[PDB]
């Protein structure tokens, strides 16, 4: 299934990659690392397709906290760039409300005076 | 004689008649393991029976004989609607939810009936595939599928993991109705859900309702839990602006 | 029980509670033994005395009760884990 | 890449989309689209047809549970929305190798019939009678089959390779076009049950062919990367052959309003499926649209407007004439 997933990714069929990766999580049984990798892959393809709710649901199911934080960083950035700020407000971050403020502060101060919407 | 008279039946497929006879010849062969050169093995060659049907009937015979591994290996060999439901229900009755999931993932049977969709949801839930079961409920009947999802998550102890999901306003309204109706423990879970969603007014009003209903409750463990719940919410109530306190204290 | 009878009294009280809480957080960080041997040092154990002390702890109804609410949420999570 | 002129949201992925090519007696144009497990019938009205419409008025009329992924949709000529005797009839092919004929009164009477006999995937199907009594289908079993509405096989033509597209001739009675994957387009007479003629493509695989309704001498197709045009009876060789897509062309459809305009789609690809609208007088596409992942291509009956199905969306492109 990991081989067929690489093939479907190279052909550019993200809906089928999500379906197959969901089946492959069933076979991954006790390997939490493979489950983390497959769920990170499902998150990425849902995010790329603009399926914000399903991407958020996939992110909450990631067992690896390090990958979950990197997926959370990617979700926050992509939704901010797409101007989908309402969904981002609705999404219930756990103890990571100050990670968002720290990221936007790090970018804000790091970036030039010409404002956009990070400060807003 | 009663077996052979099946061949005289009109408007029956010949292969279905041969299927009953083959299934019967397998029972006879199994009754006599000690002679390898039985003329009985010539039956499929003598009546031009496809090797495909042979393996399928062997698979069904092995299933009724409690050899589920070799049964599935015969049926899955590369060489009906009611059979899908019965195979899945049989595998679930025996506790082998993993083989029921394997079967469902490979064969992908079309769930046409509310019974088949509830069956497929139960296979997915028994394998901890909650997100797939949840998506299947949304795809297929929405009140019945959500009811089945919430009842099975409550029976399996998965309600805390369900509360971590993203709900639509409709799914959320139905979850609130379900958790309000289904006992005092589910009203404490609904309180936790309101707190996790920053819905502090609804959490405080629900706790006032629970404070009024528990004035006669002996039980030591429920009394200690209600004491802790009351203390936490009385701390949140102190932090609220005077106006929000008034709105929370106005019945 | 701090009886900051005057303004600055309360000013300073707040200041100190704040700083102390920060320091305590940081210190507990590596506190009760990082569980390398356990599935990441889960805090299953809950102390009733800490919760009782928090209730009798006196400070402004805003930030202090918000911290109390966070502690209550943590206690609820611990109860869910026990369930 | 031009944005779509109009976009309509759908419940799920659109695998096939077909405008009703017939007159239904309504002011709106009927549209059918196939999802993973359903077929939706909708009415579309455009600002270009009625000045009271702002952009696109899209109304779902009926949803049919299919249970399988729909691969092709064919409208029946008997389809009418007239208030006196409304009749919806269409055929579908799906991944289960079956044809389903749906019949509806747009009220409570919803019937479907299953037709079995293809041993491979059905790639395309059409109604092949002016009266709408007969269905032609083609597939990976290397057959073209003719069915009555009763699901009885009337005729069968053995193909030399997988049948990839089938089309009824718009004016000439009894002429069926069948496009084979190896580049051969055959014409069959359904009265004599004989092959009349063939065309050959210079490129392979041949993926889709369509008749020009405005000029019944013209056939257009896609094979390999290129679009190919023939003009009959002048030659069995292509009149024109030009690049359509950088990586595999999938669908070809003639405009129903202009004999020089056609649309092509690229294969369900990593570079999001391109739609290219061509005009014969131009060496390059007149319009290049992007759909993230889209299947089905159909032209509006009257307007210079085409539709492609995509991820939970229908995309419409108006071509300036």
Walk me through the structure.
The structure is cut from a larger assembly and holds chains A (120 residues), B (251 residues), C (83 residues) and D (321 residues). Chain A has helices at residues 2-11, 14-27, 32-48, 52-60, 65-81, 85-90, 97-110. With 120 residues, chain A is mainly α. Chain A is elongated. Chain B is elongated, with a radius of gyration of 29 Å. The longest helix of chain C is centred in the N-terminal third of the chain and has 23 residues, at 7-29. Chain D is an all-beta fold. Helices cover 0% and strands 51% of the residues of chain D. Chain D has no helices and 28 strands. In chain D, a hairpin with a 3-residue loop joins β15 and β16 (184-189). Chains in contact: A-B, A-D, B-C, B-D. Chain B: This is Protein ELYS.
Detail the topology: elements first, then pairings.
The structure is cut from a larger assembly and holds chains A (120 residues), B (251 residues), C (83 residues) and D (321 residues).
Chain B: H1 14-31, H2 43-46, H3 51-64, H4 68-75, H5 81-93, H6 97-107, H7 114-126, H8 130-139, H9 142-155, H10 159-162, H11 169-181, H12 184-196, H13 200-213, H14 220-239, H15 242-249
Chain C: H1 7-29, H2 50-56, H3 63-82
Chain D: E1 6-9, E2 16-19, E3 29-34, E4 38-46, E5 56-65, E6 70-75, E7 88-94, E8 99-104, E9 110-115, E10 122-127, E11 134-139, E12 143-148, E13 153-158, E14 163-168, E15 175-180, E16 184-189, E17 194-200, E18 206-211, E19 218-223, E20 226-231, E21 240-243, E22 249-254, E23 261-266, E24 274-279, E25 287-290, E26 297-299, E27 305-309, E28 313-318
Number of strands of chain D: 28
Percent strand of chain D equals: over 45%
* Largest sheet composition of chain D: 4 strands, antiparallel
Q: Name the overall outline of chain D.
A: globular
Secondary-structure element order of chain D, as H and E?
Answer: EEEEEEEEEEEEEEEEEEEEEEEEEEEE
What general form of chain B does the structure show? elongated
